[PDB]
Amino acid sequence: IELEFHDVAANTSSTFDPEVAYANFKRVHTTGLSYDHIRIFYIKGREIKTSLAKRSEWEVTLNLGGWKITVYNTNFPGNRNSPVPDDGLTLHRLSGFLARYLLEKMLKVSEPEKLIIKSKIINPLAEKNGITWNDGEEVYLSFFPGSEMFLGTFRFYPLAIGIYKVQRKEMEPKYLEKTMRQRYMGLEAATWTVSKLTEVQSALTVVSSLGWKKTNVSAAARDFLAKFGINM
Amino acid sequence: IELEFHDVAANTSSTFDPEVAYANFKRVHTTGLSYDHIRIFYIKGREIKTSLAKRSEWEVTLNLGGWKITVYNTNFPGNRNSPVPDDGLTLHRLSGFLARYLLEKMLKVSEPEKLIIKSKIINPLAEKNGITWNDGEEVYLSFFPGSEMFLGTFRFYPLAIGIYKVQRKEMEPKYLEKTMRQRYMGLEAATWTVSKLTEVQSALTVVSSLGWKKTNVSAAARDFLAKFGINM
Amino acid sequence: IELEFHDVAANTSSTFDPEVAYANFKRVHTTGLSYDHIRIFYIKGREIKTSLAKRSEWEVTLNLGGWKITVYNTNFPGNRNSPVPDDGLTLHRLSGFLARYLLEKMLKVSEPEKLIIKSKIINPLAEKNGITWNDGEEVYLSFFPGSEMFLGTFRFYPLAIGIYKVQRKEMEPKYLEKTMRQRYMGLEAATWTVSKLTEVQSALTVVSSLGWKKTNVSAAARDFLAKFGINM
Amino acid sequence: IELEFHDVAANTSSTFDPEVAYANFKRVHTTGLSYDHIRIFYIKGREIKTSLAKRSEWEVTLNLGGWKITVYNTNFPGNRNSPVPDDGLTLHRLSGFLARYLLEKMLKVSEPEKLIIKSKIINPLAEKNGITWNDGEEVYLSFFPGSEMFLGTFRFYPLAIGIYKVQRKEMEPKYLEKTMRQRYMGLEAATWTVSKLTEVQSALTVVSSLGWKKTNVSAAARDFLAKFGINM
RNA sequence: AAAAAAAAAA
RNA sequence: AAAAAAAAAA
RNA sequence: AAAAAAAAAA
RNA sequence: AAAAAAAAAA
């Protein structure tokens, strides 16, 4: 005879503000900060995710490359739905924070630095779709998970990519719902949806225009194989 | 060389009577009883279910919010098919018992109490389908699992919802069979099916008339997204 | 550095002869034997199977109801492909042995015994398809797994049922291959297939003629539900 | 609070050269070597694979039949992506090494030896598709996994089989990508694809011409069953 | 079989 | 990426 | 619900 | 391969 207890659940709205959260991540973390830390984070980010989901423990500090950043492991499933606080980091919260932090550099800084950084940061989700750095800073960066916290700065690319994928059938449409709960230049989506449909409609156009060749196999092996029936 | 034994299985019919069972749950349990206990039970009822299926042990007592009610854990799989007795409670047996017990209050009581209760009880399965309290007491309550033990009091809403879902394709039709074994005003289904087809046919109409907007995403994000192709 | 060894594999044909095997099961086992042992075996045979697949150990003796019969547990997966010998019993080998042993009684014996036995033995796979004892001894018995070891005595019902299911789409066609390796009145299938196609074709007819109403739900709930769209 | 570290990842190309690798496997291993070792390897190769994926440890030495050969267990999943070196063996690397090593014998040697070997080696993947030794040495051998390391010696049969399967729908097309990264007579695939399309196109023809009867069931049971509707 | 096991609010 | 992981005879 | 969990470079 | 592993009554 074991005793299990449950408690009422309150009803309010969400307090976690991506803007505070980022401005609160900027000082507390990234004292150093190396582009080589971000580079590590992002190219091993799929590995980084698989570990945290194996490990059953819910504060994990990660060292990459020499940069120590501790992330509430909400991946490890069950998480277990242990609330992150509004001042909490997550592999996801972290990804987009960095994604925005890079774009603030890409804008703020000089040209010679802009050339060292684009040589240093790589986006495994972008460049799988053959989407490269010269396709624009905001668009490359918008492939990083968590860039949907910042449709503001990312010019509704994270959402447009999102539409474009669900549309072409390359992504289930569940993966679009976190995003539609978002905000754009301080506007809730019950308003930006009505009153901003263009930029959205406009960003989808740019995104539609891109390469988008899936790089499961080489360009030369694609055509070759097609001459046989196989399009992959 | 291990020895495993099996015993014959007898042939009779089912003795568990929802009416006795409820009238036997009314006194033994709910001395207090708070609407705040029921509220706890129902909004955490999905959690409550996931625990009992993790825990391997077959009498579990649950405390919600301060109300202690012990439930043969038939969820924990294998249950293991350890018979519940006719005087036994189950997450399911319990759900519908409460579901009926609320409706007895909704009927029995005053108007000012009827307004405090509807403010206090929430039905996560109803209100996911945007089905609200003002859609009628019996209909809201009929979304609670186990309301199919009481097609009598629930006016064949639990079954009509059931048809409507299987029909629209929103539910597999296996989930309709426990229900068709049921009884209606003391009548076995080999009779109520023949001789009651209207009320059934009648309740499906009411149910068909309802909102039924799936709330995976906001109303404003639905229309927005549709302008792009995505209906979700 | 661990060392793992593998050995050549020889090439001959199969030595296990259902006829010897049965005639060797008849004396060694069933000294008693009760119809109440067989009844136990067959109605709990689905349970009996689920145990043996949980238990990791490969000689298991089962007691039903008071009859002790030890069965190389090839179910427990991996079995593990530990060869059964030609004098070995298996839940499957056992099922059909009994299936044939009953039919030898059904034939050999008197009428008053024939009425006690048909009242005592139940076939959970037959009677799910509403196929009953009066549909003929061979046909009812041919639903028992392992009756395909004896197409001879079972008059190519085990195979005809098999065709009929694959055909109607009620069974995957993998489940027909063990059977086509079989023999019929001493004839290998490369011969009975050519030269016996009628009886086969003939038994399918009988089998086609049967009830075959799937009893997932009552007959009265089927028609009722159909009046709504749902055929199950 | 646990600390997990990740390190940058470099960018170059692949150094593992099937030609060196084979010529480095030829002396270091196969001092003896028996056709009876290869025979063991290949007919138990499916078993051999299932063990290595159960065992969690990453250097495994295998003894077959008396031939000891140690293979970095990359099967055991996660492998775990512990790099094999260019001088490393793998169940796969090993399979094709042997596959080529047999073909070097089939070519190098006399006729009476060529008749003992074809009697001794069996290819479980070939002969499931009823593809036999007399269908040519290169074609039989090209069914062995890892023969795609040597499109050179195997006359683009490993790839043609590959096309033919993806085409007929008998294989997912993911399983064609390792192969398209390969090389042919010293030529990278961005060149052999352009400039060799015939031999490829030519080898597909030969492969298309073959039996390819799936031997899930006997030839006599196929026709028999078809007379009933069932083609398997 | 009036028996026991998926969908679960803002 | 000339890297590493499904289909396996009578 | 501005909450938390799939697709991941050469 | 006459070999061994899904559907299981009221």
Whole-angstrom CA distances from D104 to B16, D25, D99 are 77, 14, 9
Query: Is residue D218 a contact partner of residue C189, using CB atoms and an 8 Å limit?
Result: yes
Whole-angstrom CA distances from D32 to B193, D29, D39, D67 are 80, 8, 14, 8
Query: What is the C-alpha separation between A61 and D3, in angstroms, rounded?
Result: 5
Q: Are strands D60-64 and C2-5 parallel, antiparallel or unpaired?
A: parallel
Nearest to D4 among A41, A60, A227 (CB): A60
Residue in the block written with tokens 């447009």: A160
For residue B23, how many C-alpha atoms fall within 13 Å in the half-sphere facing its CB? 4
Amino acid making up residue C39: R
Q: Around Cβ A32, how many Cβ atoms within 10 Å?
A: 10
Query: Is residue B126 a contact partner of residue B99, using CB atoms and an 8 Å limit?
Result: no
**Tokens at B143, concatenated:** 């979304």
Inter-axis angle of helices D18-28 and D91-108, nearest 10: 80
Q: Which chains touch D (3 or more CB pairs under 8 A)?
A: A, C
Q: Which CATH superfamily is domain C130-232 in?
A: Bunyavirus nucleocapsid (N) protein, C-terminal domain (1.10.472.180)
Closest CA to A141 of A199, A98, A203, A179: A98
Contact with chain A for residue D107, Cβ under 8 A: no
Strand order in the sheet with C67-71: B2-5, C60-64, C67-71
- Contacts (Cβ under 8 Å, ≥6 apart) of A168: none
Helix (H, G, I), strand (E, B) or coil at C139: helix
Helix (H, G, I), strand (E, B) or coil at C197: helix
Query: What is the C-alpha separation between A161 and A110, in angstroms, rounded?
Result: 28
Query: What is the C-alpha separation between B122 and B141, in angstroms, rounded?
Result: 9
Residues of A whose CB is below 8 A from B48: 6
- Contacts (Cβ under 8 Å, ≥6 apart) of B133: B118, B121, B140
Q: Are strands B60-64 and A2-5 parallel, antiparallel or unpaired?
A: parallel
D97 CA vs H1 C1’ separation (Å): 31
Q: Which residues of chain D between 83 and 122 are close to nucleic strand F, CB under 7 A?
A: 83-84, 90-93, 95, 122
**E strand or H helix that includes residue C61:** strand C60-64
Query: What is the C-alpha separation between B150 and A96, in angstroms, rounded?
Result: 51
Q: What is the 3-state secondary structure of A113-128? A: HHHHHHHHCCCCCCHH
Helices (H), chain C: 18-28, 35-43, 45-54, 91-108, 111-120, 137-141, 157-168, 177-180, 189-195, 197-208, 219-226
Q: What is the 3-state secondary structure of chain A? A: CEEEECCCCCCCCCCCCHHHHHHHHHHHCCCCCCHHHHHHHHHCHHHHHHHHHHCCCCCEEEEECCEEEEECCCCCCCCCCCCCCCCCCCHHHHHHHHHHHHHHHHHHCCHHHHHHHHHHCCCCCCHHHCCCHHHCHHHHHCCCCCHHHHCCCCCCHHHHHHHHHHHHCCCCHHHHHHHHCCEECCEEHHHHHHHCHHHHHHHHHHHHCCCCCCCCCCHHHHHHHHCCCCCC
Nearest residue: Cα versus C1' of E9: B124
Nearest residue: Cα versus C1' of F6: D175
Q: Around Cβ A229, how many Cβ atoms within 10 Å?
A: 11
Positive or negative, the Cα torsion across C143, C145, C150, C151? positive
Query: Is residue C99 a contact partner of residue C146, using CB atoms and an 8 Å limit?
Result: yes
Any bridge partners for residue D4, and if so which? A62
- Chain H: bases < 7 Å from a protein Cβ: 1-10
Query: Is residue B92 a contact partner of residue A36, using CB atoms and an 8 Å limit?
Result: no
Nearest residue: Cα versus C1' of E10: A11
B95 CA vs H4 C1’ separation (Å): 46
**E strand or H helix that includes residue C187:** strand C187-188
Query: What is the C-alpha separation between D95 and D73, in angstroms, rounded?
Result: 13
* Cβ of B49 less than 7 A from strand E: yes
Instruction: Give the start-to-end residue ranges of the domains of chain A.
Output: 1-129, 130-232
Closest CA to A227 of C88, D193, B54, D85: D193
- Whether domain A1-129 has CATH 1.20.142.20: the reply is yes
**Tokens at B183, concatenated:** 């009884």
Residue C4 DSSP class:
E
Q: In chain C, positions 11-70, which contact chain B (CB-CB < 8 Å)?
A: 36, 39-41, 43-44, 47-48, 51, 55, 57, 59-65, 68, 70
Contact with chain A for residue B159, Cβ under 8 A: no
- Chain F: bases < 7 Å from a protein Cβ: 1-10
Query: What is the C-alpha separation between B123 and B161, in angstroms, rounded?
Result: 14
Method: X-ray
Q: What is the 3-state secondary structure of chain D? A: CEEEECCCCCCCCCCCCHHHHHHHHHHHCCCCCCHHHHHHHHHCHHHHHHHHHHCCCCCEEEEECCEEEEECCCCCCCCCCCCCCCCCCCHHHHHHHHHHHHHHHHHHCCHHHHHHHHHHCCCCCCHHHCCCHHHCHHHHHCCCCCHHHHCCCCCCHHHHHHHHHHHHCCCCHHHHHHHHCCEECCEEHHHHHHHCHHHHHHHHHHHHCCCCCCCCCCHHHHHHHHCCCCCC
Chain C residue with Cα closest to B164: C228
Nearest to A224 among D1, D173, D197 (CB): D197
Query: What is the C-alpha separation between C45 and C123, in angstroms, rounded?
Result: 10
Q: Which residues of chain C between 112 and 131 are close to nucleic strand H, CB under 7 A?
A: 122, 124-125, 127-128
Contact with chain A for residue D6, Cβ under 8 A: yes
Chain B residue with Cα closest to C222: B180
For residue A26, how many C-alpha atoms fall within 13 Å in the half-sphere facing its CB? 12
Contact with chain C for residue D221, Cβ under 8 A: yes
Query: What is the C-alpha separation between D130 and D118, in angstroms, rounded?
Result: 15
Q: Residue C198 burial (CB < 10 Å; 0-12/13-18/19+)?
A: exposed
Closest nucleotide to residue B77 (Cα to C1')?
Answer: E5
* Cβ of D166 less than 7 A from strand F: no
Q: Are strands B67-71 and B60-64 parallel, antiparallel or unpaired?
A: antiparallel
Contact with chain B for residue C195, Cβ under 8 A: no
* Cβ of D74 less than 7 A from strand F: yes
Closest CA to C135 of C43, C45, C213: C213
Query: What is the C-alpha separation between D182 and D179, in angstroms, rounded?
Result: 5
- Contacts (Cβ under 8 Å, ≥6 apart) of B69: B29, B61, B62, B89, B94
Strand order in the sheet with D2-5: A67-71, A60-64, D2-5
Closest CA to D103 of D134, D142, D74, D54: D142
Query: Is residue A73 a contact partner of residue A55, using CB atoms and an 8 Å limit?
Result: yes
Query: Is residue C204 a contact partner of residue D225, using CB atoms and an 8 Å limit?
Result: no
Whole-angstrom CA distances from B216 to A46, A150, B187, B213, B232 are 27, 22, 39, 9, 9
Q: In chain B, positions 171-190, which contact chain C (CB-CB < 8 Å)?
A: 173-174, 176-177, 180-181, 189-190
Whole-angstrom CA distances from C203 to B203, C196, D73, D135, D231 are 47, 11, 53, 42, 20
Residue C15 DSSP class:
-
What are the phi and psi torsion angles at C125 (to 5°)? -90, -35
Q: Which chains touch B (3 or more CB pairs under 8 A)?
A: A, C
What are the phi and psi torsion angles at B24 (to 5°)? -95, -15
Nearest residue: Cα versus C1' of G6: A175
Contacts by D81-84 with C-beta closer than 8 Å and gap 24+?
Answer: D82/D58
Helix (H, G, I), strand (E, B) or coil at C193: helix
Query: What is the C-alpha separation between B180 and B157, in angstroms, rounded?
Result: 13
